[PDB]
Amino acid sequence: TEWRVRAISAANLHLRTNHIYVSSDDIKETGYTYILPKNVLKKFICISDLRAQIAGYLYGVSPPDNPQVKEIRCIVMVPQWGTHQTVHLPGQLPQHEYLKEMEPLGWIHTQPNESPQLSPQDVTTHAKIMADNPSWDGEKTIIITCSFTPGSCTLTAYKLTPSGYEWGRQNTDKGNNPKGYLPSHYERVQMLLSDRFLGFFMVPAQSSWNYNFMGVRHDPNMKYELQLANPKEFYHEVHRPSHFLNFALL
């Protein structure tokens, strides 16, 4: 029942937005380059938690000039619940009118501790999403990990090689060290934060994205409908109605 301590800690999450470091200089120049607006990143960090991972699907479009740059125009929050190692998301991919023009570009998630490698749980999740829905191209989708460090948050991006995609779908182990996991599976893509344009959010209608507290009401086969509205923070009152109701019972 340390949710109170965690909420007190997460209340001071805007401070980390004052400084953000982005990995670079390790990426091969060949391939796509992804550009993330600052406002959606700041909001995503603000609505996150220090010990529970959250995730959001990325939708974007290439600028008309060149197709080697991907502009992430939107972030979609879906009914989800996460541990400190992985995020559980519904099987259904988000579907909405505004998403027709924008192609999926992968997903972005936070993690408590910065790690040099890419989490095998993340690799498995990405590979399984690829296998389930063919709308996700093998080379056009990326995993953006926003790891939390003392002071600031360190963004980095990864993509899956064909060998990694093959391994992930057949991987069943969910431990820290699965069988036959090697760094050749993933690769680093180039990502830049830019404030020259603004993105938006889409959140589930008739409900909220966070299901960490009412986890029993979350099923992988659940269906949802999106709406155009900014998400609420992790410890918002609507996310934990049991805490408010039980206290009244007291």
Partner: protein, 66 residues
Amino acid sequence: PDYVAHPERWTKYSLEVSSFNQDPSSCGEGRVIFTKPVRGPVELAHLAGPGFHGSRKRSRDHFRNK
């Protein structure tokens, strides 16, 4: 903290053709041409343009008085 160890790898971010005055005789591009949007027995002639002088007592009884 890899950012302090290898600052070169990481990058710090603050994060805060028309035609006017048409007439029936016109041609060429820019001419706005209309296209379907595919969504009185009595004649009024005037329409469409063309003290105490003590006068003699009137004959009367040809007035309304009602």
